[PDB]
């Protein structure tokens, strides 16, 4: 159709659809991102979305979540090899550990949760202002038993960080990840819990 297809143009259309389309069809789009990555003129961004697309439905697919994470994780590693943002891929990386965990979350959570936390620590280290890194930590603290020092209260400042960051940030160039923005805002409300606040009169 178009005379030429730019890398940014191709991803921009795919990302826009990716946001709107159900996570079920993510597998379909993931293949396209992989196809884009196969192209020599591709960035770590292609690898990022390839892993992302596979990882998101993984949470809803305990049947082979661990196995499907292998390709996504490898793709994340490829992005790392290219020289892409460590924090962003680390965020996906931790989710991959979490997704495979859901198969035995009451059993192996001790190990995978720790692995995810380590990966998240990497995300915070790589980008200390990363909204997604704080978001993932916020829920991690939420799901962390009190004996490990977790709790909703711990998650509160992290929820604030992610939300504050989105407000002060922009999504550029265009096909940059739009996900996590809505969730972080909701997460803070969830983190507070109750939220009766009778308001002034």
């Amino acid at each position: 159709m178009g005379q030429g297809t730019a890398y940014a143009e191709v991803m921009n259309r795919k990302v826009a659809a990716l946001d709107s389309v159900p996570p079920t069809e993510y597998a379909t789009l993931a293949a396209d991102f992989s196809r884009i990555a196969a192209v020599e003129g591709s960035d770590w961004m292609a690898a990022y979305y390839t892993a992302y697309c596979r990882i998101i439905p993984a949470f809803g697919n305990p049947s082979e979540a661990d196995r499907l994470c292998e390709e996504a994780e490898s793709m994340l590693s490829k992005a790392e090899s290219l020289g892409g943002d460590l924090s962003e891929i680390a965020c996906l990386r931790s989710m991959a550990a979490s997704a495979r965990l859901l198969v035995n979350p009451q059993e192996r959570w001790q190990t995978y949760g720790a692995e995810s936390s380590r990966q998240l620590a990497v995300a915070l280290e790589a980008n200390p202002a990363n909204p997604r890194a704080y978001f993932l930590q916020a829920q991690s603290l939420l799901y962390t038993p009190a004996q490990f020092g977790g709790g909703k209260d711990k998650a509160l400042p992290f929820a604030e960080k992610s939300v504050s960051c989105y407000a002060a940030a922009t999504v550029s160039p265009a096909y940059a990840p739009h996900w996590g923005e809505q969730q972080a805002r909701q997460l803070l409300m969830l983190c507070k819990a109750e939220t009766q606040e009778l308001v002034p009169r």
Side-chain angles (χ1 to χ4, degrees), residues 8 34 46 53 57 80 84 88 90 95 98 102 106-107 119 125 130 134 138 156 158 168 171 190 192 194:
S34 180
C53 291
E80 184 177 296
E88 290 289 83
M95 291 200 302
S98 299
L102 297 177
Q106 294 178 31
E107 181 188 315
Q119 292 168 331
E125 181 180 71
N130 189 330
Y134 285 98
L156 291 174
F158 282 80
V171 181
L190 298 177
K192 290 190 294 177
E194 182 222 88

Coordinates of all heavy atoms in Angstrom, one line a residue, residues 8 34 46 53 57 80 84 88 90 95 98 102 106-107 119 125 130 134 138 156 158 168 171 190 192 194:
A8 N 9.6 2.8 12.5 CA 8.8 3.5 13.4 C 7.3 3.4 13.0 O 6.4 3.2 13.8 CB 9.2 5.0 13.5
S34 N 8.5 -10.1 16.2 CA 9.6 -10.9 15.9 C 10.1 -10.8 14.5 O 11.3 -10.8 14.2 CB 9.3 -12.4 16.3 OG 10.4 -13.3 16.1
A46 N 11.9 -3.6 19.1 CA 11.2 -4.7 18.4 C 11.2 -6.0 19.3 O 10.2 -6.7 19.5 CB 11.8 -5.1 17.1
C53 N 4.6 -9.0 24.2 CA 3.4 -9.6 23.6 C 3.2 -11.1 24.1 O 2.1 -11.5 24.3 CB 3.4 -9.6 22.1 SG 3.3 -7.9 21.4
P57 N -0.1 -12.5 27.8 CA -1.1 -13.7 27.8 C -0.6 -14.8 28.6 O -1.3 -15.7 28.9 CB -1.1 -14.0 26.3 CG 0.1 -13.5 25.7 CD 0.5 -12.3 26.5
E80 N 18.9 -6.5 25.4 CA 20.0 -6.1 26.3 C 21.3 -6.1 25.6 O 22.2 -5.2 25.7 CB 20.0 -7.1 27.5 CG 21.1 -6.8 28.6 CD 21.0 -7.8 29.7 OE1 19.9 -7.8 30.4 OE2 21.9 -8.6 29.9
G84 N 19.8 -1.8 24.5 CA 18.6 -1.1 24.8 C 18.4 -0.8 26.3 O 19.4 -1.2 27.1
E88 N 13.5 -1.3 31.3 CA 12.3 -1.6 30.6 C 12.3 -3.1 30.3 O 11.2 -3.8 30.5 CB 12.2 -0.9 29.2 CG 12.0 0.6 29.4 CD 10.5 0.9 29.9 OE1 10.3 0.8 31.1 OE2 9.7 1.2 29.1
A90 N 14.0 -5.4 32.0 CA 14.0 -6.0 33.3 C 12.6 -6.1 33.8 O 12.2 -7.1 34.5 CB 14.9 -5.2 34.3
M95 N 8.2 -10.0 35.0 CA 6.8 -10.5 34.7 C 6.9 -11.9 34.2 O 6.0 -12.7 34.5 CB 6.1 -9.6 33.7 CG 5.7 -8.2 34.3 SD 4.3 -7.5 33.4 CE 5.0 -7.4 31.7
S98 N 7.2 -14.1 37.0 CA 5.9 -14.1 37.7 C 4.8 -14.9 37.0 O 4.1 -15.6 37.6 CB 5.4 -12.6 37.9 OG 6.3 -11.9 38.6
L102 N 2.8 -18.5 38.3 CA 1.3 -18.7 38.5 C 0.9 -20.1 38.3 O -0.2 -20.5 38.7 CB 0.5 -17.8 37.5 CG 0.7 -16.3 37.7 CD1 -0.1 -15.5 36.6 CD2 0.2 -15.9 39.1
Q106 N 1.7 -21.1 45.0 CA 1.6 -21.4 46.4 C 2.7 -22.3 46.8 O 2.8 -22.7 47.9 CB 0.2 -22.0 46.7 CG -0.9 -21.0 46.6 CD -2.3 -21.6 46.9 OE1 -2.4 -22.5 47.7 NE2 -3.3 -21.1 46.2
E107 N 3.5 -22.6 45.8 CA 4.6 -23.6 46.0 C 6.0 -23.0 45.8 O 6.8 -22.9 46.7 CB 4.4 -24.7 45.0 CG 5.4 -25.9 45.1 CD 5.2 -26.8 43.9 OE1 4.1 -27.2 43.6 OE2 6.3 -27.2 43.3
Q119 N 15.0 -9.1 39.6 CA 14.9 -8.5 38.3 C 14.3 -7.1 38.4 O 14.7 -6.2 37.7 CB 14.0 -9.4 37.5 CG 14.6 -10.8 37.2 CD 13.6 -11.8 36.6 OE1 12.5 -11.7 36.9 NE2 14.1 -12.7 35.9
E125 N 17.4 0.0 39.4 CA 18.8 0.4 39.3 C 19.0 1.0 38.0 O 19.6 2.1 37.9 CB 19.7 -0.8 39.5 CG 21.2 -0.5 39.4 CD 22.0 -1.8 39.6 OE1 22.1 -2.6 38.7 OE2 22.7 -1.9 40.7
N130 N 11.8 5.1 36.5 CA 10.9 4.3 35.6 C 9.6 4.0 36.4 O 9.6 3.4 37.4 CB 11.6 3.0 35.3 CG 10.9 2.2 34.3 OD1 9.7 2.2 34.1 ND2 11.7 1.4 33.6
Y134 N 8.5 1.0 39.4 CA 7.8 1.3 40.7 C 6.5 0.6 40.7 O 6.1 0.1 41.8 CB 7.6 2.8 40.9 CG 8.9 3.5 41.3 CD1 9.6 4.2 40.3 CD2 9.3 3.6 42.6 CE1 10.7 4.9 40.7 CE2 10.4 4.3 43.0 CZ 11.1 4.9 42.0 OH 12.3 5.6 42.4
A138 N 5.3 -1.9 43.5 CA 4.2 -1.6 44.3 C 3.3 -2.8 44.4 O 2.8 -3.1 45.5 CB 3.4 -0.5 43.6
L156 N 2.5 1.9 48.9 CA 1.9 3.3 48.7 C 2.9 4.3 48.0 O 2.5 4.8 47.0 CB 1.5 3.8 50.1 CG 0.3 3.2 50.7 CD1 0.0 3.7 52.1 CD2 -1.0 3.3 49.9
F158 N 5.5 3.7 46.2 CA 5.8 3.1 44.9 C 4.7 3.4 44.0 O 4.9 3.7 42.8 CB 6.1 1.7 45.0 CG 7.5 1.4 45.5 CD1 7.8 1.4 46.9 CD2 8.5 1.1 44.6 CE1 9.0 1.2 47.3 CE2 9.8 0.8 45.1 CZ 10.0 0.9 46.4
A168 N 4.4 13.4 34.8 CA 5.5 14.3 34.5 C 6.2 13.8 33.2 O 7.2 14.4 32.7 CB 6.5 14.3 35.6
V171 N 4.7 10.0 26.3 CA 4.9 8.7 25.6 C 5.5 9.0 24.2 O 4.7 9.4 23.3 CB 3.6 7.9 25.5 CG1 3.8 6.6 24.8 CG2 3.0 7.7 26.9
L190 N -6.1 1.0 45.2 CA -6.2 -0.3 45.7 C -5.2 -0.4 46.9 O -5.6 -1.0 47.9 CB -5.8 -1.3 44.7 CG -6.7 -1.4 43.4 CD1 -6.1 -2.4 42.4 CD2 -8.1 -1.8 43.8
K192 N -4.2 2.0 49.0 CA -4.8 2.7 50.1 C -5.7 1.8 50.9 O -5.7 1.8 52.1 CB -5.5 4.0 49.7 CG -4.6 5.1 49.2 CD -5.4 6.4 49.0 CE -6.5 6.3 48.0 NZ -7.4 7.5 47.9
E194 N -9.9 0.7 51.6 CA -11.0 1.4 52.2 C -11.3 2.7 51.4 O -12.2 2.6 50.6 CB -10.6 1.8 53.7 CG -11.7 2.5 54.4 CD -11.1 3.7 55.2 OE1 -11.0 4.8 54.7 OE2 -10.8 3.5 56.4

